[PDB]
């Protein structure tokens, strides 16, 4: 099914995740339908940790996409933030 | 808003079909001179209205045979 999940990037020991909407059969770091935010686990200084687009998130969730557990937790964090 | 191409009939031997020669003018990629180019397209005319020498207009459609995927619209100029 269509899913919303984290694709890995960055360097060793310091991952940086793109929050992407994709078909579950695609590879983790490959083909995707849309990019709707990022997540930096080790942000410091002025670096922003979480940016999620609530409008597109709601749109895709309404169209039947199933978030992963981590993305659901991050969406809850962003809901509390705003 | 069907795509439409205007040409002139060059054959009418086939049954319920016509062949129309379409010409375009484009610039040369390296030297820039305007140069002639042409393509021949098979069309479908159920009633055999068009004949050799007339100017016609055709539109795109679903395949009707192995080589024909275009259909007659009007005879712009009769031969």
């Amino acid at each position: 099914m269509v899913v919303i999940r984290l694709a890995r990037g960055g360097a060793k020991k310091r991952p940086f995740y793109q929050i992407v909407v994709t078909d579950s059969r695609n590879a983790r770091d490959g083909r995707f339908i849309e990019r709707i935010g990022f997540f930096n686990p080790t942000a410091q200084g002025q670096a922003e940790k979480l940016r999620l687009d609530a409008d597109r998130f709601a749109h895709w969730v309404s169209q039947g996409a199933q978030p992963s557990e981590r993305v659901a937790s991050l969406a809850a964090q962003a809901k509390k933030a705003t | 808003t069907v795509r439409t191409l205007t040409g002139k009939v060059v054959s009418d031997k086939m049954d319920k079909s016509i062949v129309v020669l379409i010409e375009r003018r484009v610039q040369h990629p390296l030297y820039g001179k305007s140069i002639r180019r042409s393509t021949k397209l098979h069309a479908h005319d159920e009633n055999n209205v068009a004949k050799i020498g007339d100017v016609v207009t055709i539109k795109e459609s679903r395949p009707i045979s192995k080589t024909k995927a275009w259909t007659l619209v009007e005879v712009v100029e009769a031969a």
């Binding site: - | 030297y31 820039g32 001179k33 305007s34």
Partner: protein
Amino acid sequence: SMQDTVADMLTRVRNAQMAKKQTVSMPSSKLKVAIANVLQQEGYISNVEVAQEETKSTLTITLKYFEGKPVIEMVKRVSRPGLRQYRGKDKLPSVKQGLGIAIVSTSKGIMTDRAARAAGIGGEVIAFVS
């Protein structure tokens, strides 16, 4: 046979200037008249006349010399029947860093490159003059 009347007119002007003659006459056409008027309004030539007898028209141009030298130091034909040159507004040519003129045929008429840039239009580059 004769196949480029604009080139023929430009060549006649150039050779007359090199031979240091005050006037040059040739068969006339409306395109040549327009080009001559543009040259006159840009100051390369003094005067332009057209005289008709029965059905044949003759264009006469008066030439200028300054400091004992031809005013038109360089005149070149750009677009020819063999190769035709069309340029957009952004890519219009400049002659001697704007010290010359490029004659341009546009839908609004025959004008210089700077005027064409001001109008935001392009067209056919006819000649370079400086």
